[PDB]
Every structure is written in C-alpha cells, then in structure tokens.
Amino acid sequence: XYXXXYX
Amino acid sequence: MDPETVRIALGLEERTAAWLTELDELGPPAEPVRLPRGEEARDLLRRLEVPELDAEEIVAAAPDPDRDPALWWLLERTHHAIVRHMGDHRAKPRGGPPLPYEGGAAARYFHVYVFLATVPAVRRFHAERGIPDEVGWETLTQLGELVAIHRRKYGQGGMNMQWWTTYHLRGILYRLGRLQFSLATGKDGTPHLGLAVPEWGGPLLPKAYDESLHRARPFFDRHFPEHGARVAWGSSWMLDPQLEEYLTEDSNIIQLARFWTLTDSAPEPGNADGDSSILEFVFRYNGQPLDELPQRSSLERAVIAHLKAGRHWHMRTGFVKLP
Numbered sequence: 001x002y003x004x005x006y007x
Numbered sequence: 008m009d010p011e012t013v014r015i016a017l018g019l020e021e022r023t024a025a026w027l028t029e030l031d032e033l034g035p036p037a038e039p040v041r042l043p044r045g046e047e048a049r050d051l052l053r054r055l056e057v058p059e060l061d062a063e064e065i066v067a068a069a070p071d072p073d074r075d076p077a078l079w080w081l082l083e084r085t086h087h088a089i090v091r092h093m094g095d096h097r098a099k100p101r102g103g104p105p106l107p108y109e110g111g112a113a114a115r116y117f118h119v120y121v122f123l124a125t126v127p128a129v130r131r132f133h134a135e136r137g138i139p140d141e142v143g144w145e146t147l148t149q150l151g152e153l154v155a156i157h158r159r160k161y162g163q164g165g166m167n168m169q170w171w172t173t174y175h176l177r178g179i180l181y182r183l184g185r186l187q188f189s190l191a192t193g194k195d196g197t198p199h200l201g202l203a204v205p206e207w208g209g210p211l212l213p214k215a216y217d218e219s220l221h222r223a224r225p226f227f228d229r230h231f232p233e234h235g236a237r238v239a240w241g242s243s244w245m246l247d248p249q250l251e252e253y254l255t256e257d258s259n260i261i262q263l264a265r266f267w268t269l270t271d272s273a274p275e276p277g278n279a280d281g282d283s284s285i286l287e288f289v290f291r292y293n294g295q296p297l298d299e300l301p302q303r304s305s306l307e308r309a310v311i312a313h314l315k316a317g318r319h320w321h322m323r324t325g326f327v328k329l330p
C-alpha cells in the first residue's frame with residue numbers, strides 16, 4: 001500500500 | 008499561462024505534465040474561484056473543524072491571482088476538475104499532485120484552498136439532493152481531521168489527502184454518525200455503499216457502529232433513490248483475521264469484524280502490501296525505526312510484534328448486508 005484509490 | 012510554465016514554476020515532476028495538459032484543456036470554471044478571506048474564512052474553517060493553529064496559518068497564506076499566478080492557475084482548474092464530476096462516483100478520485108513545500112504555506116495548504124473554493128458547489132449539490140444541513144456539514148468536517156493528521160505526521164501544516172477529499176467534494180460520500188458511506192459500484196456495476204471509518208469521533212463502539220448501519224439505507228434510498236445498494240463493502244487492515252492473535256475480546260474491531268463476510272482469498276504470507284496501510288492508520292507512519300514507535304495500546308504492541316516476527320499484515324475485503 002500507502003496510496004489509496006479507489007480505481 | 009501554459010501548463011509547462013506552471014509545472015516548472017511550481018517544481019512539479021515531469022510525470023504531472025499529462026494532468027496539467029488535461030487541466031489546460033478543461034480551462035477555468037464558469038463560476039470563477041472565490042476564496043473566503045479574513046473572518047469569513049475563519050468561520051468556515053471552524054465549521055470544518057480545522058484546528059485553530061492551522062486555520063490562522065491558512066488564512067494568513069491565502070494565495071493571490073497576481074502574486075501567485077501559477078498556483079492560482081492550478082487552483083482554478085483543479086476546482087473545475089472536481090466539480091465537473093459532482094455526483095459522479097464512476098469518475099476516478101483525481102485531486103491532483105501535492106505541491107513541493109519550497110512554495111511555502113500556500114503550496115502546503117493548496118488543497119485546503121481547493122476544498123474551501125469548492126464548498127459552495129458541494130453544498131448546492133447537498134441542497135439539490137435534499138441532504139440535511141447537519142449531515143452535509145458533518146461530512147465536510149473531515150477536512151479538519153485530515154489537516155490535523157498532516158501536522159501530526161509531518162510536523163508542519165498541510166493536507167496531502169486530496170484524492171480522498173474528492174469524494175466529499177463531489178457529494179458522493181456522507182458521514183452518517185460514526186461511519187461514512189460512499190456511492191460505489193462493484194466491477195460488474197452492481198451498486199453498493201463503500202464503508203469508511205474516519206479517525207475523529209472516538210472508539211468504534213458497537214452501538215455507534217449499529218446506528219450508522221441503520222442510517223445507510225434510509226438515507227441513500229431517500230436522497231439517491233436511483234442507486235439502490237443492499238450491501239456495504241469495506242477493504243481494511245481492520246478486517247485482517249490475524250488481529251485475533253493479539254487483540255482481546257473487549258476489542259471493538261474483534262467484536263464487529265465477526266459480522267463481516269470476507270470475500271477475498273487468504274493472502275500469501277509473504278505479501279507485504281498491507282503493512283503500509285496498518286502502519287499509516289495506527290501510527291501515521293513516516294519511515295521511522297520500528298523501535299521508535301509508541302507502544303501504549305494493545306494494537307500498537309500487536310502491529311510491531313507481528314512485524315518483528317517476520318510476519319505481514321493484510322488488507323482484507325468483505326461485506327455486510329444493510330439493515
């Protein structure tokens with residue numbers, strides 16, 4: 001991780 | 008201005024050029040960007056629960072179209088790129104890149120200005136959808152939480168979770184008590200509500216959790232009748248059954264996860280992707296040595312112990328039917 005989304 | 012000049016002035020990486028071209032083509036919004044100033048800005052920041060220290064700094068640093076032309080160009084078009092998707096949960100959450108902190112307080116708080124400039128538009132959407140004012144405001148208060156988190160994590164004022172605030176600002180996410188729910192769809196397009204848990208608001212007590220769940224269908228069926236979700240979906244470090252090794256029966260997470268049906272496969276033990284998620288949410292981790300992290304709570308001790316053991320934490324995905 002450490003990023004996010006949601007795509 | 009041209010996007011290449013903006014990029015260079017702001018110190019933005021070459022990779023952001025595509026985005027800036029997008030924004031160049033989109034152009035300025037029909038309704039020109041208006042930043043609140045002075046006591047108006049202080050009143051709004053306070054309504055959004057931004058800590059006093061940060062709010063004072065935000066008001067002080069507010070940028071100007073003439074002195075900050077590259078930043079202003081980006082602010083206008085970033086705001087536009089959000090409101091163009093008002094109500095639209097099928098659009099990706101693109102809030103734009105963070106600005107290098109060499110640009111000072113205006114750069115650090117850039118996405119706060121984006122959020123402030125966009126409050127009128129989303130509140131108009133709230134009204135159009137018949138959303139109660141107190142729900143609208145309660146939703147938007149996560150700005151203050153995210154601002155406070157930036158300072159805890161990095162030591163100075165900022166807000167670098169602009170991808171997440173695109174949900175609030177497009178009117179697709181609502182805080183209904185302790186939990187938030189977003190309009191969402193599965194891969195096959197089936198509507199559901201995405202569940203999230205904001206940090207502020209105290210422990211995830213079962214009664215508070217239960218109340219929020221009871222609010223979900225009536226709220227969305229009233230204001231977004233076209234959606235028609237029957238289930239809530241969550242992906243979280245909190246759904247990892249490995250927590251059961253470490254947390255006791257009085258744990259809110261343990262009690263409430265028992266209601267969830269996990270829909271992903273048991274992850275590979277060597278998969279380390281979920282480590283950064285649990286470290287962000289438990290510690291707001293910023294690369295420091297694991298020994299240096301606090302150990303006051305059972306969860307804090309648990310995260311580190313498990314990692315020290317050579318083991319990994321996993322985001323897990325599941326659902327609960329909406330009552």
Ligand SMILES: CCCCCCCCCC(=O)SCCNC(=O)CCNC(=O)[C@H](O)C(C)(C)COP(=O)(O)OP(=O)(O)OC[C@H]1O[C@@H](n2cnc3c(N)ncnc32)[C@H](O)[C@@H]1OP(=O)(O)O
Nearest residue numbers: 203204206210211241243258259260264288289304305306
């Ligand atoms: C579980 C059912 C929900 C499943 C759906 C998941 C979809 C959600 C998608 C997301 O939003 S992922 C991000 C979720 N949000 C966060 O992680 C926000 C930051 N976390 C928190 O604020 C708390 O972790 C939270 C309010 C969510 C829960 O706290 P609780 O206190 O209710 O949890 P619990 O009762 O299980 O805690 C057990 C122990 O760990 C401690 N603890 C819990 N969260 C902690 C934390 N975040 N940092 C340090 N300690 C923490 C807690 O104080 C307690 O310490 P002691 O046993 O020593 O008394």
Ligand SMILES: *[C@@H]1O[C@H](CO)[C@@H](O)[C@H](O)[C@H]1NC(C)=O
Nearest residue numbers: 006007189190191192193201
């Ligand atoms: C993230 O997007 C995916 C698919 O669009 C969806 O399944 C999930 O619920 C979304 N998350 C939120 C919080 O809306």
Ligand SMILES: *[C@@H]1O[C@H](CO)[C@@H](O)[C@H](O)[C@H]1N
Nearest residue numbers: 004168171202203204205
């Ligand atoms: C995903 O990340 C968001 C930003 O940290 C957070 O607000 C949300 O609770 C989580 N599901």
Ligand SMILES: *[C@H]1O[C@H](CO)[C@@H](O)[C@H](O)[C@@H]1O
Nearest residue numbers: 003004005006007099101
């Ligand atoms: C998922 O993939 C998208 C591109 O489709 C990225 O923008 C995102 O950062 C994540 O890696």
